[PDB]
């Protein structure tokens, strides 16, 4: 270092700290101003840099953000990776590094085309470039758009913007507001402060708009069974039997009382084709008392090619949902977690027969669009675990007659970490975006009911064997976001980009 903050070594360190500051914005800590402070740090530290230096600054900021926020992936790698301790740490640092590239990319491109510090760079160029940059991290090599700052404000002042343009609009606006604040602090000029406050305060009245209308007549008692069943060391018929006894014995008392019962992802730990007698018998018991069950299961279905394809599945039983193996009322998982449910670069099969022994097992993908689940005259658009954080995918599957949004997930991995909470926060956003109640049941994890505005209706603690029963009411409204999607944001992002690129090219 030489003089003040003008020298690079200090800025990389400061970028590391402000990146880490962004973690506090998300679900466990729930401090939304940490987003603006984090973004101001990223915006201000990239001022007056060479594109390469800014890209380095950006990379560090991402490393502080992703290293502190995503480090919970270690507990899954350590358990099932079969790897030494130091390698697992190496893999986690590698993941945070890979994610920080896009942050470094954002800063590198921002500095080259918009080097001078001007409101154009912070308020126009950055939010559009950030919109593109955050997209790449989310679209490249099967996703992982985790820790988007829009979710940090589910309870905050800007929540009214979400039902209109979606969560990615809050990402766009937060980058915008932070830029004006960072510009105001660096230039010692109050004019961007006024604009930033105005830009920040104007969306506040939008939280009082209700784009949905409720429906007392369709009010139902719903039950979500959270079995605390641990992850399996050894699979025998005894553990399977122990698992079904846990769920059925909790399900049987509520069959008469509650209209809909939900079981978490892969609740039945056996293939669907084996359990046909248990399933058909369970359907009868439910239909007689006038209730319906929604459960996750593993389905290996014979392909036309006569080989076997395995799907992560949701199936429907009970009244209004007669169970059939060929029944079209079911959900198969589309987007598969990269190293958990599938092996990337599966072409490595050639060395496999000699030398080592590698996993050949991989799941299969369902259709990108699947019809909503129908049970008890209720339409549920469903998503399994990770899928709920994909906002565009959820909205495309959402059909206006949909009564509830449904997520079943197994958070048993990551337990006691901040991951399940981060996961839970993003799920709330889908409810506010679409103005529908969300029913989320986990094996162990956050099992709760969320209202149309993102309000938490009812919740049960983690790591317990419990049933969450309460009354939930449907809503028939249509938000602007449900109709348009994020098309308006991209048009705005094009307009901002088109203008900012045209100004940079002179
Ligand atoms: C491998 C991932 C690279 C790890 C990124 C950390 C870079 C860093 O923070 O080094 C700055 C240092 O504090 C100097 O000021
Ligand atoms: C330079 C400006 C730095 C500002 C930092 C804001 C930090 C706010 C810290 C608020 C902490 C909230 C919290 O501690 O929640 C923790 C969790 O619930 C239990 O571990
Ligand atoms: C500055 C924050 C930089 C933090 C980046 C260091 C990564 C932390 C890490 O990988 O540790 C795994 C964690 O301990 C498993 O729970
Ligand atoms: C302000 C600088 C301090 C901000 C650092 C926050 C890091 C944090 O939130 O710690 C969570 C931890 O990574 C959970 O594994
Ligand atoms: C390179 C990454 C290789 C390690 C990834 C393997 C892994 O973590 O597996 C998780 C497990 O399958 C979760 O169910
Ligand atoms: C380029 C390389 C970038 C970093 C890749 C390194 C490690 C990623 C492996 C960690 C992710 C695998 C964990 C598996 C998992 O999380 O499974 C959970 C469950 O199956 C679904 O919800
Ligand atoms: C122009 C846009 C480029 C964006 C590059 C994309 C990601 C870079 C993120 C990784 C950080 C790159 C570090 C570069 C570096 O270390 O620079 C060496 C030094 O500046 C030489 O004199
Ligand atoms: C230049 C890249 C432009 C890519 C736009 C494609 C797109 O909008 O993808 C939708 C995405 O899933 C929504 O976040
Ligand atoms: C140049 C275009 C960049 C390629 C991304 C466009 C794209 O893949 O579209 C997103 C798709 O709709 C969602 O997966
Ligand atoms: C939070 C950061 C807000 C920074 C505002 C700094 C500012 O307004 O500068 C004073 C103004 O120039 C009066 O002379
Ligand atoms: C999604 C939400 C999209 C909202 C976009 C709405 C208005 C854009 C106005 C942006 C222009 C505001 C910058 C003006 C400014 O910063 O001026 C500072 C001062 O005058 C310098 O000396
Ligand atoms: C909506 C409210 C906008 C108020 C803007 C404002 O208060 O700016 C004053 C500034 O902080 C004084 O230097
Ligand atoms: C290569 C793309 C990076 C994929 C990393 C896998 C990952 O992020 O796992 C998260 C976990 O699966 C959440 O359920
Ligand atoms: C600064 C932030 C400014 C936010 C703009 C505020 C309101 C615009 C929304 C006006 C309503 C647009 C019509 C959409 C609509 O009415 O959706 C219902 C329809 O049934 C679906 O097909
Ligand atoms: C520069 C990229 C401009 C391409 C914009 C068109 C585009 O990629 O849109 C894809 C479409 O949304 C797919 O569903
Ligand atoms: C290298 C210079 C860096 C420039 C940095 C800023 C450039 C932003 C410009 C255009 C963004 C693409 C605009 C694409 C508009 C169409 C996207 C779209 O329509 O896709 C949405 C649809 O809903 C999908 O499902």
Numbering used by the authors: 3 to 508
What does the paper behind this entry write?
The rest are acted on by the third and last enzyme in the PTM pathway, apolipoprotein N-acyltransferase, Lnt18. This transferase N-acylates the Cys* of the apo-lipoprotein using preferentially phosphatidylethanolamine (PE) as a lipid substrate and generating the triacylated lipoprotein product218192021. Lnt is a member of the nitrilase family of enzymes with two domains, a membrane domain (MD) and a periplasmic nitrilase-like domain (ND) harbouring the enzyme’s active site. The active site, defined by the catalytic triad, resides in the ND slightly above the membrane surface with an opening for substrates and products that leads into the bulk membrane.
The LntPae structure and that of an inactive Cys387Ala mutant of LntEco were solved by molecular replacement using the native LntEco structure as the search model. In support of this, the structures of Lnt solved in the course of this study contain a varying number of structured monoolein lipid molecules from the mesophase in which crystallization occurs. Some however reside in the H4–H5 cleft and occupy positions between Arm 1 and Arm 3 and above Arm 2 that feed into the active site pocket. In the LntEco-Cys387Ala mutant structure, where lipid density is well defined and plentiful in this region of the protein, the lipids arrange themselves in single file along the hydrophobic pocket entrance into the active site. In the C387A mutant structure, a row of single monoolein lipid molecules appears corralled in this proposed portal formed by Arm 1, Arm 3 and the H3/H4 cleft that connects the active site pocket with the bulk membrane. It makes sense therefore that this conduit can be navigated by phospholipid substrate molecules, especially in a sideways orientation with the sn-1 chain on point. In several of the crystal structures solved in the course of this work host lipid molecules are visible extending deep into the binding pocket and next to Cys387. In one of these (LntEco-C387A), the γS of Cys387 is 4.5 Å from the hydroxyl on the glycerol backbone of a structured monoolein. This is compatible with a mechanism where a fatty acyl donor substrate, such as PE, accesses the site with its ester linked acyl chain at the sn-1 position of the glycerol backbone proximal to the nucleophilic thiolate for reaction. The apolar nature of many of the residues in the periplasmic extensions of H3 and H4 and the three arms is consistent with this finding. These observations suggest that the positions occupied by the structured lipids define the route to the active site taken by the phospholipid and lipoprotein substrates of Lnt.
